[PDB]
């Protein structure tokens, strides 16, 4: 979830 | 620009571009850098970005 959050943003 | 033989020039070119890119990547996965602009009203946990 963290990698997704700060990757897609 | 004579003193440095033209090689070292483009070397540092690629060097700073790489270090800047990795800076952006590191700041991307960085805990404290999300800095809720204007915390002087702490009213909410607003998540913003930097770098």
Swiss-Prot record, chain B:
Description of how the protein assembles with itself and partners: Homotetramer and heterotetramer with GRIK5. Tetramers may be formed by the dimerization of dimers. Assembles into a kainate-gated homomeric channel that does not bind AMPA. Can form functional heteromeric receptors with GRIK4 and GRIK5. Can form functional heteromeric receptors with GRIK3. Interacts with DLG4. Interacts with NETO2. Interacts (via C-terminus) with KLHL17 (via kelch repeats); the interaction targets GRIK2 for degradation via ubiquitin-proteasome pathway.
Subcellular location: Cell membrane; Postsynaptic cell membrane
Free-text description of this protein's post-translational modifications in UniProt: Sumoylation mediates kainate receptor-mediated endocytosis and regulates synaptic transmission. Sumoylation is enhanced by PIAS3 and desumoylated by SENP1. Ubiquitinated. Ubiquitination regulates the GRIK2 levels at the synapse by leading kainate receptor degradation through proteasome.
Residues included from the entire protein: 556 to 606 of 908
Transmembrane segments: 7-27
Protein name, per record: Glutamate receptor ionotropic, kainate 2
Expression sites (tissue/organ): Highest expression is found in the olfactory lobe, piriform cortex, dentate gyrus, hippocampus, granular cell layer of the cerebellum, and in caudate-putamen.
Functional description taken from the UniProt entry: Ionotropic glutamate receptor that functions as a cation-permeable ligand-gated ion channel, gated by L-glutamate and the glutamatergic agonist kainic acid. L-glutamate acts as an excitatory neurotransmitter at many synapses in the central nervous system. Binding of the excitatory neurotransmitter L-glutamate induces a conformation change, leading to the opening of the cation channel, and thereby converts the chemical signal to an electrical impulse. The receptor then desensitizes rapidly and enters a transient inactive state, characterized by the presence of bound agonist.
Stated family: Belongs to the glutamate-gated ion channel (TC 1.A.10.1) family. GRIK2 subfamily.
Misc note: The postsynaptic actions of Glu are mediated by a variety of receptors that are named according to their selective agonists. This receptor binds domoate > kainate > quisqualate > glutamate. It does not bind AMPA without coexpression with GRIK5.
């Amino acid at each position: 979830s963290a990698m997704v959050e700060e990757l897609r943003m | 620009l004579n003193p440095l033989s033209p090689d070292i020039w483009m070397y540092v070119l690629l060097a700073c571009l790489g270090v800047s890119c990795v800076l952006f990547v590191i700041a991307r996965f960085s805990p404290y850098e999300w800095y809720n602009p204007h915390p002087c009203n702490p009213d909410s946990d607003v998540v913003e970005n930097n770098f």
